[PDB]
């Protein structure tokens, strides 16, 4: 069943991440066990098998991968995706400079950087209303008016820290 999230053709943009639900099915985990391909596997729960689920996919900057894990203040975890302090499974990632990055820039992947309050675990926010640090409804180009969503823009030629990495957070219940 997993072949639809991983291996998948197109990926969602963090703030607007996609949650998949896989019911009544079995997979070996061995398609995951091997293949160094992934640049991250920290599994905050275990690492074995028992053929017993949640799988959220999205795409973040390089250094922003650090944030897909419990604790961790954020800016990504404060405003885009927050993993519960306790309850957990696994966080997975891979570099995709060639798939998600162009030589001219590919600003199609977005992230929220302005919000009032922090995202409680597993939460999501697709709002897109002009932001202001007091609540005053905004209307650009008015002063202190910002559109909370911004593009990443992955150029094929940027540091590994600033390259497009896709993410799949496999959560178990």
């Amino acid at each position: 069943p997993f072949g639809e999230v991983f291996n998948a053709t197109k990926f969602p943009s963090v703030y607007a991440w996609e949650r998949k639900k896989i019911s009544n099915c079995v997979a070996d985990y061995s398609v995951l066990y091997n293949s160094t391909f992934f640049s991250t596997f920290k599994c905050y729960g275990v690492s074995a098998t028992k053929l017993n689920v949640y799988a959220d996919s999205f795409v973040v900057k390089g250094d922003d991968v650090r944030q897909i894990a419990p604790g961790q203040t954020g800016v990504i975890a404060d405003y885009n995706y927050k993993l519960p302090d306790d309850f957990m499974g696994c966080v997975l990632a891979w570099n995709t400079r060639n798939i998600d990055a162009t030589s001219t820039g590919n600003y199609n992947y977005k992230y929220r950087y302005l919000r009032h309050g922090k995202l409680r675990p597993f939460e999501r926010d697709i709002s897109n209303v002009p932001f202001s640090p007091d609540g005053k409804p905004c209307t650009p180009p008015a002063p202190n008016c910002y559109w909370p969503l911004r593009g990443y823009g992955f150029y094929t030629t940027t540091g590994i820290g600033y390259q497009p990495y896709r993410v799949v957070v496999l959560s178990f219940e």
Binding site: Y113, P133, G153, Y155, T158, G159, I160, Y162
Partner: protein, 597 residues
Amino acid sequence: STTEELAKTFLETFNYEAQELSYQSSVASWNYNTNITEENVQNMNNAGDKWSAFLKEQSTLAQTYPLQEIQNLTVKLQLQALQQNGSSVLSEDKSKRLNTILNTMSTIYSTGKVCNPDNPQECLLLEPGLNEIMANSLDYNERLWAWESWRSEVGKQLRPLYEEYVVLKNEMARANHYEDYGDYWRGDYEVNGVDGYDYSRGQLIEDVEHTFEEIKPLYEHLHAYVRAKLMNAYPSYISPIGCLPAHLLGDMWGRFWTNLYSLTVPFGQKPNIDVTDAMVDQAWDAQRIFKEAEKFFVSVGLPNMTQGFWENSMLTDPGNVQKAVCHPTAWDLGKGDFRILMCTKVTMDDFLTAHHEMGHIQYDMAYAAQPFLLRNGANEGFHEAVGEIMSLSAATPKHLKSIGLLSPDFQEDNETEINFLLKQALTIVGTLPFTYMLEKWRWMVFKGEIPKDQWMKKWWEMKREIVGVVEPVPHDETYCDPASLFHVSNDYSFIRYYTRTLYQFQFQEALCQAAKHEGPLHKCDISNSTEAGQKLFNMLRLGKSEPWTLALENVVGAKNMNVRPLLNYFEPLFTWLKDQNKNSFVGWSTDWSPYAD
């Protein structure tokens, strides 16, 4: 939603957007300088122009916030930067005119070419041609000619412009609460609130004129030495007690006495701290050079170049079928995307250069954490000094044997050393005064202390005092030489070249005693020492984050630019000279002249 809280959120937006426009600006600027076509050049502007746009916008936008309401000091510092109130405070008329001026001066200096009065059908540009002359010519007249030709054609032309240039520029400065365009520049060194780390826009002048004093002895003596040496080169054209004739100092202005090595070398019977052969004799290629430098920095506990660095960088001349600008350059395009442009050529000069450059790259990374506006050297000097720190260690025969470019059997003798040592004075210690008097003159001219009709009679009145150099033909206010030099006729803080000089040494000392160094200070090679690396990385990763004084501290261990460590590098020398000058006159009369009458 305080006043700070609002700024907090501003900068945040500025940072993420500036990162994208600036990156787009560099990539274009990069594709040009490495492919020079029409589509790539046209492009360089569009991107460059967008980034130029975003600034004025964001600058005259940071006005929303009155700086004096900031607690998280950093913010004030950042906010301060965006407060490049540009040249807007003026009038659209003046601002227009101003830029029209700058531009001309720039193109006159670039285009100005003088033609042979004794062959009107032939002419030359500053570079090459004229410069070719000022460096190699042994003809007192041919040198004389080029020197005057230049300051006579373009010099004069720039006189009117510079005059106006001042005023306007001064107007700007005042508005922003600066005593003059002078106190403007000095700003770069200012510090506000932090205790024992502050610094006034005026103490530069104090601490410069103070430090410069302790250098005098060393200088006077170097001067005195090369003088007699020149007296032989140009028999009868010089006074044993007089000053040195400007057209005789290795280059078009006397910036650096480098090219005088030719005829001032202490012992001609010495030879090669030149591994250039050894390199070619070992089939070293571009890669080896840069790869080897990467090691050096690793050897002191710093990181390998980025995987991308090797993938993107241009290490060798593309040849034809792709024309490219060959100025060796460090590139910090942002987005953790670093790289170097160098049309590498297996020589020593290039080998050291490659280290020097990878030094910039090393500094850049160190401060990548800092917020987009703090990603730079503590000041104008810091970045150049850091690079020259490397050039210094890699140049040691010690490091050269250490790497197999110098036969392990070679043993350095104290004479080949005096050489190198003086070949240094010629560059490092020659330009010191030349620089101090220069900026001081502009400096004064900007506090008005120097009238329009004494603008040369004041130039050379200090060129004959501070630099102990004379004009081979007198000039009137028709000529404007203090601008005949790029840095000046193209508007630039020229004091950097001075401060960067000291800084680089207190850094070199700090790192030798820390890396435990036993020999004379210029025999040091921080190489393989990590513990002294750590000491660097402290002032490094700061970027502009702290006051340069703190930054300075971290390494050196002090809070000011002390010249005592430069003097240290030049102590085996300093005395060897008092020794040659036992019979020579040490000093000069400000009155003697070459032209006479």
